Amino acid sequence: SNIFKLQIDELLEQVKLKQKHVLKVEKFLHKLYDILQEIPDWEEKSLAEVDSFFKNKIVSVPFVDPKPIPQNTNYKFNYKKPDISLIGSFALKAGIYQPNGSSIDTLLTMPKELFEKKDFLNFRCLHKRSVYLAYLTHHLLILLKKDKLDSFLQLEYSYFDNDPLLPILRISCSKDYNFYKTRFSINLLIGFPYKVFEPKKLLPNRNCIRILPATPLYNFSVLSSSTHENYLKYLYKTKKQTESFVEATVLGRLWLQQRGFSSNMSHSGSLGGFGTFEFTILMAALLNGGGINSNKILLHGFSSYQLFKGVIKYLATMDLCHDGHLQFHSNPASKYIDEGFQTPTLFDKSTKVNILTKMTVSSYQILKEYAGETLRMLNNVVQDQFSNIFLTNISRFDNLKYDLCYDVQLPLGNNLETSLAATFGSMERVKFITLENFLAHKITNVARYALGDRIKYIQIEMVGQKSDFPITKRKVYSNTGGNHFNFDFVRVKLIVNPSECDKLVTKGPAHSETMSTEAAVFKNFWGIKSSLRRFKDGSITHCCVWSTSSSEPIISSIVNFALQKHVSKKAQISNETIKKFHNFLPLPNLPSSAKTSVLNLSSFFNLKKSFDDLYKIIFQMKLPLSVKSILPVGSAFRYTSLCQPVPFAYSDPDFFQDVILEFETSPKWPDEITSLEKAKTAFLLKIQEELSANSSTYRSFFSRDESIPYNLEIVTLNILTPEGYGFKFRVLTERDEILYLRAIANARNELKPELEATFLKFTAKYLASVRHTRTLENISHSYQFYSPVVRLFKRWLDTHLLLGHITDELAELIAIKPFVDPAPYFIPGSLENGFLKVLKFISQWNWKDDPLILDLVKPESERLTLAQYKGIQMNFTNLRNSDPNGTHLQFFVASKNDPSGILYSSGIPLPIATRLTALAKVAVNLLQTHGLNQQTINLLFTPGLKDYDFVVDLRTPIGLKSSCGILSAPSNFPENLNDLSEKMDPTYQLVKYLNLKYKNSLILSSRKYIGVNGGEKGDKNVITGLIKPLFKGAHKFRVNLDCNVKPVDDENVILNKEAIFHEIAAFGNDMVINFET
Amino acid sequence: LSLSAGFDWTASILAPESVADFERLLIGNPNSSVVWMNYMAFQLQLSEIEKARELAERALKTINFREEAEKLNIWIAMLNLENTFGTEETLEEVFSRACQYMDSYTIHTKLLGIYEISEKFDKAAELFKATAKKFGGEKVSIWVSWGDFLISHNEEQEARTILGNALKALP
Amino acid sequence: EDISAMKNGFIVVPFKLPDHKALPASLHFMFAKRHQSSNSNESDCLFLVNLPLLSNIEHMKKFVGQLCGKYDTVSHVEELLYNDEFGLHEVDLSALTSDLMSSTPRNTALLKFVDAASINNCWNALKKYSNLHAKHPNELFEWTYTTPSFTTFVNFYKPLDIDYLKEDIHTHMAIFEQREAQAQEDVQSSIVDEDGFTLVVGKNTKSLNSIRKKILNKIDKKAKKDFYRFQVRERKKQEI
Amino acid sequence: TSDDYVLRIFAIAFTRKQANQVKRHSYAQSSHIRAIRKVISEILTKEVQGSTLAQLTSKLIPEVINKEIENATKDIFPLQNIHVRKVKLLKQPKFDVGALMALHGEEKGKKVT
């Protein structure tokens, strides 16, 4: 906790505004306040008279829509001096330094005498306010010219909290009174006096616009404008009572900003409505109660962390929209009512206002999940969470912050279609002041109803909406809008639910003799797509049926249909980003592959069943030792193999799934290492011999394995299952482990590190591998999208020639980071969302100074404890102490299955590691510069190939893409099993064998998966090289040089690049085609 | 177009006068004992004996195990390091550790020269007696090197005695 | 090209290289030196540096023969020692784990001859064969890069011969049981030193070597704080 | 288990007489019983911790566990009729439908009109 307190203080001082810039601003506004009092009074005017008065002036009255007409504007207008005042954060001295800039709110109270008691009807007051703002702007303009400040101050109108009904004047300073360096902008709020209109008549339920339907937004606009100083006085008291208020207020403001929240209006569509002011009020509501029993939830003695946590905990758990709300008094204890108003509510009974009218239900719902999300983080004790809570921005990319994004291009967008516009109607104008406010609600309702349980959180955003317009125009002007609609296009962002997202029916109400209300609306909503169906359960319910595709999710179809039917039949809904990513995933050559959803793992289940049949056979076979256990360890068993397994497609590298065979403990094993290997084979001979006789349908052959350095006697049995699958068998013996340890002990000291590497590979292949596949198999079930994203990620590595060195295991452990540690983001729920998060992590991950340690546990036992965690942390520090630069080891990936962390990341040359970081940085930078679009994503998946010193073009005789089961095909295994080679791609073994020879001089890389990344025929592959710096230059001749060189002088040689070209050319034989240097 | 990143070979994407310069040099020159010795000597000049020892262990591991000549330089530097700035115990530890890894007789020779250079003649005489007892029966050089030392220090009679012992032990 | 010898004594021995379609007079050079070592098996050898790819004895046999014809010298190459292209044979894991069945630079190998008359004859040719590049590079030899071993190495994905594998297991186990049987008797046979000390060998121990390895690998609680008059007296001293 | 299944196992074993034994009985001293009991507890703990419930039940059917116990306890005291007497399931994790389907190796209705 003490670490947290010091961290908080370090943050506060860093963001603390510099007091000199405070004085610079107070010097101005005080002088500005003199200007305002200079402004002369005015007499009563009619709308005709004021129109003439402003007819020729540069200033234009920014009237609110609908503009007053001569008939209804019989009431007059007049301007008097206001009661100037300063409100907002700067009043409470709780502001902070913002690089983008802050805002100084100055409230101008219109005198009461400029009102009638019934001015709160039919926009009467809003009109009176608009002109009064207009009169100030003109006279302020000339007086600004008189004092010669007009040189560096720019004047424009804008909307307060993006409220169209509340235009305001904004003062900003371009580059003595110049406050540009202060990065502040003054905003002149024209608010009404307190209690001018009976607040009872302005309650949300009532109506104030004659046309009856209620007008919560319009009611909020006037009533809030009349209550500004009151909330300043209320907040001011609390800051006195509790000494911890201000630093509590800043923290929330910091937290809110990172999550892309603000006090700006949300009904228009942008995410917001929960800003510092509301976060500030919500404490003052809690500091005077908060519970159902009205008991205090926050004490004035609470420190900064305690106040902050209480509010976050309050939002996370108690509900304010559907069931229950909080009411308090500014001027009486705060109490949580059970009854709910179905909208985010926080009354202020003293003032009869609802502070959360600007909050949308969709926005409010998301705010909880962030509240609930951090509250788990905040209670976390094992890992520090300060950096994630406060010092990380999730709102930079919507796609990282939202699983699926759809952009709907509405028709006729210089005014919107007449048909759609007629839907706006008079009634909804009263309910919804602007069309944008209305249309956002139309989209979210139908989008919310149609997707149903398929989604968790939905946001509808009016892209390209402005809020500030020049003084010469009355309302905002959009290039597409033409003053009609302040937006360009609407983007639908969704947080999908992986469990039910791919459900092929949308269930509905159950059938009954009389059509129920819930049943009726369902039939109306989906129309023809609606059908009444029966299942094999025996149930009869209305439901509509869709079709999966291996290109797009079912959601894409639903929203496309859903919007066009009700919103407008000319809408164009498109998500090309998601579609291309789905395509990049290899498509299996199985029946009905195109209709398979990427969340389907059925291809893997068939392989497991194929294993199970062989699994029974081995047990009942009689051997000198009983079979202790047969453990599958192959890639396809953990849903991480790149291309789905396909029957008989034996050209794929991952075709032969390894399986570990362990016999009962016996004391008779050979004591020597080679004899142990040959003992293990002898069983595989007997297993092979007996298997042939009892089940001649299967076929078998032997192959050597050389992964384990210097253990050259290991032999494996390959079993070819008639279902069309391959398995490799290897025997694990208890004596096997201790024989290595004996080898390290007896080795000379210089050689002990080398033997340790050999042991490291072994424990990676036999011992640790079993634990990995078990943990990754189970955990994948809760994280549905893990199998696709990790495969597509492995694809991405291969295109850039990295899977040759990055052991496949390291690929999974990196790819699972966004899932087990989603903070500050959400769990990936879509293929685009998951893959980028893997790239975002690698980009920002500093592997020399930060270790990566993962809690391979399902979502909330088997979590890491404090002692284990401090143990792994100590390992890294001990390691970096000996290896500060990280040359020998680059990636520290550890878990319970490997506390050491070096098992899955040893031997990677530093150049390759930097590339995975460098490429990740380049990728994310590209997304920031150019948004996710078809062109950008194509770049992500094409290899540069220019940085490598020399490029050798390599080609196979036959196209393998069919033989890899990759649908752009064999149906039985060849009779003579020697033929298996003739449809294989040996480049991966060529590179592996080359690297050893030129380990000290060259780093060669090649595409392991040729079928996927080898062109249309899957037969084009490339060997790219690199020369180490020492041998790039000339070197004196010595025996220990140990590299292929050419002479220049008596004791000088240079790398014989031309010779190395042949030796590469020798291996490929016919395969090598073209060389580049 | 394509995503392309320059191949970064000092992890930057993530004469020598500073730690950064020496560490930067070792990136491309892990097998050069001279760079390691220069970095070690830089720390010793900075009075960072504890750090200078720590670099020595890294040099012993980082240098390729085949580069015996480079390794021999590192161990010799450590022998000079402990002799000049260390105590008797730590020097013995490095010395005993040194004989474990490399040719045992050679390290006896190097520590013996180090004592003569440092003018620790009293310790130098003793280490001959240990060196000659272990290797005198096989190496004529130790006896000759002893006779040089005794003659150089004006002990002719002791040289005659050592020559008699040399004949007794040698084949 | 004018160079014929490195000043440290390594004679350059240039060759011409094959022609292949992918790369449309590229040369590969070897640096050789006479090797001197009292060890008999390493005697009569030629030390070599920067050997061509996958160079087995057969490749040399072609080369030494191609040298023999041009310079009418009789030289027979016996074998190629310490030829480990890929570092696969640095550490003999069999030797480390036990003594039974295994009693035991880079880019270089030792080239042994049958007799001294052969090696000096071959060396004198190597001096001549060096001079050619300065004068007549065109007659330089050609490394085939292809031999029966090369073909076997290339064919990575080849099933092993089940008939061969069974016979390898059979002889290997038959030897091991004999060695295991021979040792286990020696440990438990009443070993006696010359001075009448009987070694202590436990039951179930198998090899004298393991006994040696175990050896290499490998009052205060009974003292009473107050038993003698000085101890209590010392306790009396500290008590006051 | 590795699945967060908390389970209890009961293992039962009996002493036996050697081939050439002449004594009527084959009682084992308590020092052997506590030694054997310690080994049996270790083996059960090792297997279940290093396994899933689905994997664990795959161990029970061939009774490889009983064979492992016998070899471990062979040095201490010869035994017979070694069995896993019972397996109790105390607690279960949150139910995961996704796993349940995978262990067992969706479907459309028929238009009713």
Ligand SMILES: Nc1ncnc2c1ncn2[C@@H]1O[C@H](COP(=O)(O)OP(=O)(O)OP(=O)(O)O)[C@@H](O)[C@H]1O
């Ligand atoms: N939701 C709301 N309901 C009622 N009054 C509001 C609301 N939001 C703002 N106000 C009034 O507007 C004044 C200024 O609003 P604003 O949101 O800019 O305040 P702030 O907390 O100072 O902002 P900032 O985040 O820019 O520092 C507040 O002091 C309050 O008088």
Ligand SMILES: [Mg+2]
């Ligand atoms: Mg503000």
